[PDB]
Design a binder for this molecule. Sequence first.
Ligand SMILES: [Mg+2]
Lengths: 101, 73, 273, 119, 88
Amino acid sequence: MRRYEVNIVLNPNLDQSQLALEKEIIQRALENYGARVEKVEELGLRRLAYPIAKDPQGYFLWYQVEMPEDRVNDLARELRIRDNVRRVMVVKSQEPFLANA
Amino acid sequence: PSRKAKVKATLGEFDLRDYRNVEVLKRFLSETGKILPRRRTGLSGKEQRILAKTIKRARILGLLPFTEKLVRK
Amino acid sequence: AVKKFKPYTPSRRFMTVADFSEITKTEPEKSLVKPLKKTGGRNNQGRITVRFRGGGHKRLYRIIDFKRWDKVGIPAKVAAIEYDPNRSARIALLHYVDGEKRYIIAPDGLQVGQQVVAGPDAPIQVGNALPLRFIPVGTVVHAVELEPKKGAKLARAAGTSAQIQGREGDYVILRLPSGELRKVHGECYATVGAVGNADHKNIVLGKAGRSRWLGRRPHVRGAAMNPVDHPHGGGEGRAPRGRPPASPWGWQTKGLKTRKRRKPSSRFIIARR
Amino acid sequence: KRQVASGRAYIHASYNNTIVTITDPDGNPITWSSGGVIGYKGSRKGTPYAAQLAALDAAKKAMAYGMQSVDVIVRGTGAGREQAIRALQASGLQVKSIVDDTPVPHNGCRPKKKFRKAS
Amino acid sequence: PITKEEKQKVIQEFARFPGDTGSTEVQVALLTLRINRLSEHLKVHKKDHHSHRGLLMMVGQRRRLLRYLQREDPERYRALIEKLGIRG
RNA sequence: AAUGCGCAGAUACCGGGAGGAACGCCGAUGGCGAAGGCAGCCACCUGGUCCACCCGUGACGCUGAGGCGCGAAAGCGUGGGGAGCAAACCGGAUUAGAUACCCGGGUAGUCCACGCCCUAAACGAUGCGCGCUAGGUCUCUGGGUCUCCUGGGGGCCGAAGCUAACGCG
Ligand SMILES: [Mg+2]
């Protein structure tokens, strides 16, 4: 297919129960559209510059979703609705570049 | 184009397409947020266009203010 | 999708009529219950009260139900969609999974087979009926009750939609199809989705006979009368409007407000009209 | 009231007047000064002389209340931005660094014909 | 887009010997498969006038090859009409 | 300078909220398109285009009287939206007069779908396709053996030769 990936920035008020359930929602709905995690990494509560919804920090995600092209644009609607997910965007991936050796 | 710092040869092996390492591209919005012209670095066109492109990508998801202030004026 | 004719007579070059492709594999009528036989009558016990009515075709009334709380938690199925001559919207038929069949004014784009449900914990897509304190801000809502347990009353005709402005405390704010902003109680049922049949405002009746087919006698003017009945009139010649516009019973008809200022329901309007 | 010695000061000209505002550092302003306070009519208002005059009228109130530690932000250019910064040290008052404002419209609202003279 | 496998099946579908990457008969068929798929989404959109002229730039290519194909053998020409299903 | 606006609290001052249209530095002597033209970012669906190996076909080519499609801005029919700006129009000033240039207000329209109009300084004021005739200097993009030899696109100075001259080269 292609070499997709996704950035999701989450609510930093997420400690022991809502964290587990709103990771399993992401995981299982990912599989419901049909997608294969390989490089899950999520990187904690970290800082931000300008006040995204009055908070100078937020939680972060990364996956390496293998998605068929048919529903990449319309799998966003499990994320349009839940306000407690802050930022959602999905990009392709490559790296043929290393300069000034 | 005078050279007072010449940030091109100062840092070694880097990456332009990456937008996770803010420690490299914190210097490339230098003070106000304005992406810098080529007289500062010396990078050629096919690197400088994607250097602008990665700042415009990473400028959405936090990590870069792109609007704010300088106080010595 | 309005069909329009060719001028083979002097009264069919302007006549248009809507298309009826939405009406599905239906149009017999339902059994011993729902419809009932209904009464036509231009007047009360005695004399005429609303002028210029009466006439036209024959017409039955189908019991369509507005209060929708009475069966919660029970899913249903859209069977068919038919066409109702009383109101101006298309109506649909619902089977419940335990055997009750009821009619509903049909929102924008329901199809045969699709599930609909109500209750305080139903999902949000086109068809579902929920109380107002659960519905997110900025949607499109129809058949809104005003204060609870009193049946659906607002925004329920032929391509109109209310809009949730914002919660505060216990009341929520509706922008209405007229344009004003009302405060409504939280425990009132509603229904998500615009009404549909939007094209209804774009048909031209063509002739003078398919106004009479709908129930409306011809409407006399006021300057073509004597002075013993209407305030305008007289005027040997053709009189110029005579000292300022008036109704047949005395009151005026350009600019005067008739809302009772003493009314208890002035605490709830900001009136944006 | 004779409150805490911290304070902010937001100044601006446009082209033909100059005003100065003094503000509590987490809230509301205290005493504003302008060019109609001075007594000037038409021209003589937006002049490079009436900057320090307003900035020295705005010291008799910041001294009469408890205010001895300023910040200053500047909003745009005109006749008077150059001299109020020198006029702060006429009262002393423990001045601090000098703060940018004046946003670019970021391709926003269309200007009038007077600024579409520049095509 | 157009993946590897349809382009790599039409070539030996319309080949004469199984070796050639393209000849007089099969390049007509490649242009025909591109026509048959490009022509469809124009019904969906109807406003990509650049893709409209791209369609016209190759209709007048495949027809200008079909003009030549008849100039050698007309039963060989009648092979490809019933083979592709074009221009009834 | 006035017409307007404000002491029933204006201008500027702080934090939330609704709401359109336009997208700052990057940016230029830059790129893309057959021409009109096109700049926030994300994915989807698609035409055109230059180079490397040089694999197979085998002259299939170039130009086109009428036909068909595209065609900035203003303008017109049918419904949605309206913040700013703003033809007509009412004021203030200037002037011998000022139906104008300058200031305060102000609708259509500029915006979105669908159907038509089809004009221009639609300008390199230069039909299209190919072959031959010394070279400098910067810049854009590939294959490389990347003090440079090579295949193309974008500028400025110059051989022979051309033109009534300016000049293209
Ligand atoms: Mg009267």
